Symmetry: D2
Subunit: 406 residues, 4 copies
């Protein structure tokens, strides 16, 4: 069983770049034929064992009976790549190429959402950086609740698709969008802070369940498979009376330490906001007594995560436009020294006459948050010194949302 005759790779034994199109030729290709890569690399000098990866499905761009076009992937080191035709069980070697390094930079960079031009813009990167500054966001202009999973070199967020809110990943390497959910279930919110996963609260049926929607990214066949369907084995829960899905998802939810309780905020019809807690075992409940002009959940990562119990302090940024608490207050959500109930603590930071519009975390730091104010200002708060520190390069900032990412 020879799969194809007079076959090969046009670019055989040449050096090719991540993102390039490689061409395969031959007689006898069939509908459903797939293409696999095997990678071999040496990071420094060659030693046994080397670095190995395979089989990794190749993205097929064009397809005919006389050949096919495939795309070379990013995110591998410089590699000897062997290209195989895969017909069900069988594999046949077509040829080899040398693939130039496609590893993504690991330094954290700040990105802003430009709603005027509908673009993601790189707002800050540390010195000796100038790759490519802007990404077109016009395929999903409503991109919302934007967050980063460390090392993915792209952004996760919510956007309208088939009449509901769904999670997408924007890949910085290609500028392409990848759906993260298998089914078309409406998504209340993304949830960050677990440690090394992005979760989402989605409508599994009559009610809402907690899903892992980043598992397709943290996995070696990402290129050909990104949609996940991983709900928790817990019951579904309805929203409390009065509340509707459109009231959620403007800001990411946050896992409390232990990852059992999730902090959300909901926007009421009259423009006021309430804190809302979610327990995947018990459901939704409103944290009573607070109705403010803006509420954003946050967390401080008190140690570096490992890609295990991720240690953190979480809370709500609470903003009032007027009165005795005019401005933005940052208050931790912690259990009472008396007993079980979760109570909002007195503020550890308060900024009168300033409105917080975005919060995000640089994960190569510990115990800090990065905040975007308007009167625009970008500033870090360090938990251990209890002091703010402004970014002096970043006063223009024509953005309502910014996000740290690598």
């Amino acid at each position: 069983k020879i799969l194809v005759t007079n076959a090969g790779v046009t670019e055989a034994n040449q050096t090719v770049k991540p993102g390039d199109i490689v061409h395969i030729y031959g007689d006898g290709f069939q509908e459903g034929d797939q293409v696999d890569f095997d990678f071999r690399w040496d990071l420094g000098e060659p030693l046994f064992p080397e670095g190995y990866l395979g089989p990794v499905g190749a993205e097929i761009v064009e397809r005919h009976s006389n050949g096919m076009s495939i795309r070379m992937p990013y995110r591998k080191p410089e590699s000897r790549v062997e290209i195989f035709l895969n017909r069900a069980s069988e594999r046949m070697s077509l040829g080899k190429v040398l693939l130039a390094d496609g590893q993504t930079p690991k330094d954290f960079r700040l990105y802003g959402i430009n709603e005027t031009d509908k673009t993601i813009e790189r707002a800050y990167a540390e010195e000796t950086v100038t790759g490519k500054k802007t990404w077109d966001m016009s395929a999903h202009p409503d991109f919302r609740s934007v967050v980063n999973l460390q090392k993915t070199y792209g952004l996760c967020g919510l956007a309208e698709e088939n009449g509901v809110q769904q999670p997408f990943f924007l890949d910085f390497c290609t500028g392409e969008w990848k759906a993260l959910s298998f089914y078309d279930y409406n998504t209340l919110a993304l949830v960050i802070g677990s440690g090394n996963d992005i979760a989402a609260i989605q409508q599994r049926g009559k009610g809402y369940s907690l899903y892992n929607v980043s598992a397709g990214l943290e996995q070696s066949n990402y290129a050909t498979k990104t949609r996940s369907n991983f709900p928790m084995p817990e019951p579904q829960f309805e929203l409390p009376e009065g509340f509707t899905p459109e009231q959620f998802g403007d800001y990411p939810g946050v896992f409390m330490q232990g990852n059992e309780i999730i902090l959300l905020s909901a926007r009421k019809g009259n423009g006021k906001w309430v804190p809302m807690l979610y327990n995947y075992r018990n459901g939704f409940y409103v944290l009573e007594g607070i109705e403010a002009d803006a509420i954003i959940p946050f967390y401080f990562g008190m140690a570096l995560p490992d890609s295990l119990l991720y240690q953190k302090k979480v809370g709500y940024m609470i903003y009032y436009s007027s009165g005795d608490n005019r401005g933005s207050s940052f208050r931790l959500l912690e259990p009472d020294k008396e007993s079980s109930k979760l109570q909002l603590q007195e503020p550890f930071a308060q900024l009168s006459d300033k409105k917080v519009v975005s919060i995000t975390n640089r994960l190569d730091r510990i115990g800090t948050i990065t905040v975007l104010f308007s009167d625009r200002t970008t500033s870090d708060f360090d938990w251990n010194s209890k002091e703010w520190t402004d970014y002096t390069d970043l006063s223009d900032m024509p953005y309502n949302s910014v996000v740290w990412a690598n």
Copy 2:
């Protein structure tokens, strides 16, 4: 694009066992359609994040236009498994099953090769063990140079296939044989002791190169892909004058610490044996001055490996049937206190009137080897105490080769 209509899984929402056949039905299946699994598991109590795996190709056993039979895999924990039809790009969910635990036992067990019945036999396991004792070896009755890669729950070795020696993996879960090399190149020897890989010296063309032949096992799509083609980026080397491939491979080669030099032994036409060293950068050379009646390379693992620099002492067991050194001597190969050259050290252990016929390592111990003698006896040597300790259960042992494995 709905792939198939009136489709599903016969065993949908039921509990199935690893090794079972699951049936898929529907109208519109096509040649080349594949099937993918996504796994979700909770080892203890459920917490976010859970355990996830996917896509993992399913082995397809039977195939028609109205449906297909697939085999459920071993080596995953108890999992919710979602089954997808994969037609090139597209995926469609067919159904879900609960897959019972398929994790393999991690305790080290001793296995012997029975050349009379052509079977692998479990010779020793520690208390409270009685699973399944024997495996049929008749598909490859010449199975040779048998070794284990820790945690694979099976045995690697050499056997004749298409007129040459090639590496195979015998899977203990199924009793099935998997080819480890993609091409049909003759294999001089398997090489163990790197830390977490099995290598092989194979004829890449005019000469011999060093390959990694276990990479297909240490990889999540093992079930549908096991053959590797991973030579080192080093030149090919011919054997020294006089020597031929049939003289090698009776015993596994051993990596010295640093994994640059490999110890081999070769059998001459007259029944004598010589030590032979191999450097993947420089080629083959005979360690001069020794011609004995049996030579087996060995290593001591002086720390537990991590699945990084694996620390060890290596050498040759040298056996003479008569004379002043009658019996089996164990001598380390180390560099001279004077300069570079590798010299055989004086023995650290010597057994007169006993012939060593197999050596193997239990990797949950440190600094020991396990040895099989004939006058049969099985005994451990502990480097730190310099003492032998016999296994009292294991005097019968109708085997010439035994191997520790998990």
Copy 3:
């Protein structure tokens, strides 16, 4: 500032064994002078970096103005040991010795408490083992609630000291007892199952707090410092009305997954037993509705711990001497599929006409417990197969408590 003159080590440049006495001589020693070790080792062949340890305080056995006797420690590899005189700030090298390997065997072994002879006995070890079988327990004949912290090569438990129950470590290497608590506070119980620590509930003042009492063992100056004082920063709690300290501590408590809730059992005056839960944030509460003839908490470790979130299923073994539930029932404690409250589940294993008197865990296995019955029988239950498997070597067993240890 030369500390001492005409000084040295009697055994300078010689090979010495762990446990040996080494002698130091010189003029000018002072009260309070200490002795430090620096260790250098090569596990396999020498490479940079080597293995290093230092300063490690030496145990001083005898002391005079003309010299001192020190004990060489166990638990290091074969090492070049440099011996330093330490006078406050200053250090002076006295000499060097070669210390033979003192690493303790890592294979799990079963030990029984012999109350007749007041001895710890090795009841089981796997083949090729015969070191030293018995340890004298007469210094603490009431040694109770015996458990192992993996890799410590000794046993932790409770014994009477200064009129109260306190934690001790019996070191297998020396047969010597080490106190684990700094203060003389009464100990209700040891608590196991956290992952890599032994906790204890102790009377910090008016009430009880949770302590870590193994931290002194998991620390490189263990030889000279073992007593810890590490309470949690949580309030103290009294026992519920009626209960008294003498009712606790016969069996180790067990951490539920997440390490927030602890399972205990308490013996009433009339010989009946009740389950008692402890929350370090909220205090003690009786798990109502159960009054049995014996109750022992247990856990299954569902993955190997790392020395992170340790995954497990925990519960109570509940024994009744008569009636519809005659015998020993094993029931998990889990939260209801309905809501928050912790409920005892229906049994996953039940043994009529057999009384469980000890439960313990072999941590190189996953998902098993080891149980000791009387009609004596020793048997493993495997969570994944739901089957018992008896140890056929272990029917005599003149013990009420057995413990797995390495």
Copy 4:
């Protein structure tokens, strides 16, 4: 045996800062009494187990019979610290304090040596940084061959002490100098690139041996013990004829991958430079055929190190003031594709009319070096893109040596 009466800590139960003096009082203190700390911390919310450390020797600043002054250490998180009096065996608790966070920032920062003012200056740190900019270098104004061990928050280098070159650590937290060698042996050079250790070539006796001189820093009692004495168990080697110690140490040596061969450069009397290799098993040898106007060894770290086999490409920067190779050439030292001998490769980067005066590595990047030129310019070379990238903030730079550090 009560050690001291009417004793306590002046600052008992108060919050104190790293670097502060804490006072201990009482009657009956003795010469040689030491003081130990035990630390307990919770990074996020409290959970069992917490973070623990102890015993950690306290630095004693003042000492009398009625009390003592101790310094509170840096580099721990915010901790409950219990303070113990240590008299030989015995310990007594004196009191407790709350120690504010002393963790050092982990972001890499660039530091320059100012030979005019004799100061270490912080030349670059990324945004939102302004701690303390300058450190006084006047205690060792000849500080030379300056390097960083990651996470130490200070600088290692060579300086004159007792008539010879010796390694010192300058601690950024305190500005204090710590000796790294126990004995007063002349040091040819520091050697970097092993992965997580700083080595040094030092005169052990008649000849030179390889030492680990950073082990005292990577160790929890660093505060009271920094001097190491850890030579390799290899013979001593003399320098080749003609060469003298004053010709070495201007630049750090570099370990080749595998850490067996070390690259050095030596300055001749006439101002010319030669490459010199060192093998700890075989000794020194000149890499013949090269005599240049400046030579600096370097390495590229091709992966992040783990604090295992550190992968890297190493070589020599070779500078000529005139001729066909005017300027600075960067050439790897690799083994020939033909055989064993180490040959200088053709340059991978060449800068005509620019002189390299310092090279250093930012270890949160991979595959880069940072270089300081004069015509001053600071620039990164990225191995994977083969492109330079200048730091635009750093043109003034009144330094001959700069170093990346955290």
